[PDB]
Amino acid sequence: MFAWWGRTVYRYRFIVIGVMVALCLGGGVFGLSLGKHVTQSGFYDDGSQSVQASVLGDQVYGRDRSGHIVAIFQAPAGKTVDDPAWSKKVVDELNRFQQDHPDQVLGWAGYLRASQATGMATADKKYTFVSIPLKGDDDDTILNNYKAIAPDLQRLDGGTVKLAGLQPVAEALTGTIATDQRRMEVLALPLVAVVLFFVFGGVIAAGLPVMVGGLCIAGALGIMRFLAIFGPVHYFAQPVVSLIGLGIAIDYGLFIVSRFREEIAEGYDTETAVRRTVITAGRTVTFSAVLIVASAIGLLLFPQGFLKSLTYATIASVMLSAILSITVLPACLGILGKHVDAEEVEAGFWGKLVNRVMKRPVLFAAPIVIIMILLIIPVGKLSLGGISEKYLPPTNSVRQAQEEFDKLFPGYRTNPLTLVIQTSNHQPVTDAQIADIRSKAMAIGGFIEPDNDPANMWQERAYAVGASKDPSVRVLQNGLINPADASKKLTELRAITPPKGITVLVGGTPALELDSIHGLFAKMPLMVVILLTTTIVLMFLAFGSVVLPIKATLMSALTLGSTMGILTWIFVDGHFSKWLNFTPTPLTAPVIGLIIALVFGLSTDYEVFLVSRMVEARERGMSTQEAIRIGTAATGRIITAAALIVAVVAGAFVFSDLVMMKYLAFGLMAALLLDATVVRMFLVPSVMKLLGDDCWWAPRWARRLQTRIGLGEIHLP
Ligand SMILES: CCCCCCCCCCC(CCCCCCCCCC)(CO[C@@H]1O[C@H](CO)[C@@H](O[C@H]2O[C@H](CO)[C@@H](O)[C@H](O)[C@H]2O)[C@H](O)[C@H]1O)CO[C@@H]1O[C@H](CO)[C@@H](O[C@H]2O[C@H](CO)[C@@H](O)[C@H](O)[C@H]2O)[C@H](O)[C@H]1O
C-alpha cells in the first residue's frame, strides 16, 4: 500500500504537485469568507431541558434586548447629569443615532429620556447610562448589527461615552481571534522559519515544511467554510486550524524532509530515496494523522455544537496535513533531488543519554513517574465554569468598562433562573396554576428577595417587542444569591410536582451551563472507551506488537493527567496570573474535552514518531537494546525540532487575550514539553528496556491480520 504510493507519486510527480496545490489554493481562496459565517453559539447542550426553556422563553415572551448595549455617560467635569444643556445635547445625539442607523438600532431607554428611571443614574447624579436594543432575531445577526454601528457609537458625547453590555463584550471576545492570527503571522511564522533553517541548513529544505503548513491552513479553512454551508461553525474553529496546521502540519514535513535527506546521504538515487522515504516516513505520518482522528472523533458524541465543529476542524486539518505530506512533499522532493541543499548520531549525545538510561532504568523511571503523578494532584480543585467578561485581560478597556458599570449600577445585571409553566393541552394556563407553582417554588431558600418581601419574588417575565403572546406558556424568574448554590438548588427546583397537567421546564443562564456540564460528563464514560480502543488498535497496526500500544497508552494518559494538573494549578489556582495577564477563573467544560483529545492525540503522535524508528531498526536484526539506541538516536534532533516548532506555535497563542485560548495553547505546550523533554528521553527507553524482548510481541494471528490488511511493511530489505 505505502510501497505502491511511493512508486506512483514519482511517476506522476507533476500531476500531484499541480492538482493538490490547486485544490489547496483555489480551495483556500474559498475559505477567506469563513470569518463572516462563523457563529458563537454551541456551548450548550441543545437537547437539554434548559435550552428548551430558553427557546420557549424567547419565542413566547420575546428576546430580552435590554443588556445588548449600555452606554455610560459622565457629567461635564464638575456638573450633574441633570444639566439642562448637557442632557439635552446627549439626547439630541442619541436621537440622530437611532434614526441614522434604523436597520440596527431598535431604540434607547434611559434616565435622560424618562426621569422615572432613577435606577439608571447614580445617587450623586454624575454617571448615567442608556440601554440600546439592537435589531436581529439571531445572536450572530445581533453581533453583526452591533459591529456595523460600533465605530460610530463610540463617537457619542465626543468619545467620552463608555460602552458595555452583552454585545461590546461579545465583540471583544470574538475580536481576539484576529489579533491572535496577526500575532501568529508576524511572530511565530518567521520564528518557525528560523528554527527550520537552523535544523536543516538551507532555505529550500526549510521552506518545504512552511509551504506544506501554509497549504494545510489554506485548505483546512476552505473545508471549514464548506462545512459552514450546512451547519454552524464556531469562532474557535480557525485558531485551532492555525494550531494544527502549523504545528503538526510542519512536524510532518520536518519528519518527511529529514527522512528524504537521510536517504539521499546513503547514496540512493532520487526515485529510490522518494520510495523509501514514503514507505517509512509517510507511513508514520499517516498513522499519526489517523491517531489524531481517532483521538478527536470521540468528541462527536458530545452534544455541544462547539465541540462538534472543533472536532471537524481538527479532523480536516490533520487529514489535509497528512495528505499533503504524503502527496505534494514527496513530489516536491522528487523534483528537487540532491538540490534540497541550497553511526555518529548513535555515538554522539543522543546515543549516550540512552546508554545510561538503559543501564540503570529504574532510577530514570521511578522518580519520573513519581514526579509526574504529583503533577496530577492539583487537578482536584478543577471547578469548571462558563464564559463571561472576565475571560479578557484585566487591562482590556472593555472588561474595565463592564466592571465600572457593575460597580456604579449594581443590580441591573441579573442572572435569573426561569421556570417555564406550560400546559400539555396547549390551553390558557390558569393564574391559579401559576400561583400553585410559585407557592411550591416559594419554599426553596437562596433566592434573591428584591425588597425583602415575598410579593415581588418569582416575578413574571417581561413581554418584549418580538413576543408571540402564547397563552399556554408562562415563565417566571428569580436570581439566586450565592451562585455557587446553582447546582444544589437547580435540582431542588427540578423536583417540583406540577399540579394537574402543567409541565415545568427550568432554564436560565445558571442552568444552561450546568446542563452542558452534565451532558458532557454523561458521555465521558463512552468517549474515553472510544478514545482508548481506537488508538490501541491503530497503534497495534502501526507497531506490529501488542505491548507497545499499551505502553504508549499509559504514557499518554500520564502526560494528559500531568498537563491537566499543571493547567489547573496555573489557571484555576491562579499562579503566574500576573505574569501571563489573566484572572484566575473557572475553566470551560467543552475546552477541557478539546484539551484532552488534542493532548492525547499529539502525545501519541510523538510516541509513534519515537517508536517507529525503533520498530524499523528491530526488524533489521537489531537486539532490543540496540533497537532503542538507533530508534531514539536517529530521531532525537528531529523530535526536538518538532517539539520546539509546536511550542513556538502554541506560545504565540499563549500570549492571547482570551483565557480559553491561553490555557488551550498552554496545555499543548506543557504536554509537548513533557512528552519531548522527560517522557521521550527517559521514560520510554527505560520502560522498553525493563519490558525486554517482549516489547516486539504480537500473536501470529495478529501479524497475519496486519499483513492481510496490507499495513504491515515496517521492514525495509
Ligand atoms: C472566540 C469567541 C467565541 C465566542 C466567545 C463567547 C461569546 C458569547 C457571549 C457569552 C455570554 C455573554 C457574555 C457577556 C456578559 C456581559 C453581560 C453584561 C450585561 C449588561 C446589562 C452569552 O452567550 C450567549 O448566551 C445566550 C443565552 O444565554 C445563547 O443564546 C442561545 O442559547 C441557546 C443556544 O446556544 C439557545 O437557548 C438559544 O438558541 C439561545 O438562547 C448564546 O448561544 C450564547 O452565545 C455569557 O453570558 C454571561 O455568562 C455568565 C456565566 O458565567 C453569567 O454570569 C456571570 O455574571 C454574573 C453576574 O450577575 C455572575 O454571577 C456569574 O458568576 C458570572 O459567571 C452572565 O450573567 C452572563 O451574562
Residue numbers in the entry: 1 to 342, 378 to 752
Quote the study on this structure:
MmpL3 is an essential protein belonging to the resistance-nodulation-division (RND) superfamily of transporters (DeJesus et al., 2017; Domenech et al., 2005). Specifically, MmpL3 exports intracellularly synthesized trehalose monomycolate (TMM) into the periplasm (Grzegorzewicz et al., 2012). TMM transport is essential for the formation of the unique Mycobacterium cell envelope that functions as the main physical barrier to drug entry and neutralization by the immune system (Dulberger et al., 2020; Jackson, 2014). The driving force for TMM export is thought to come from the proton-motive force (PMF) established across the inner membrane (Grzegorzewicz et al., 2012; Székely and Cole, 2016), although the precise mechanism by which the PMF drives lipid export remains unclear.
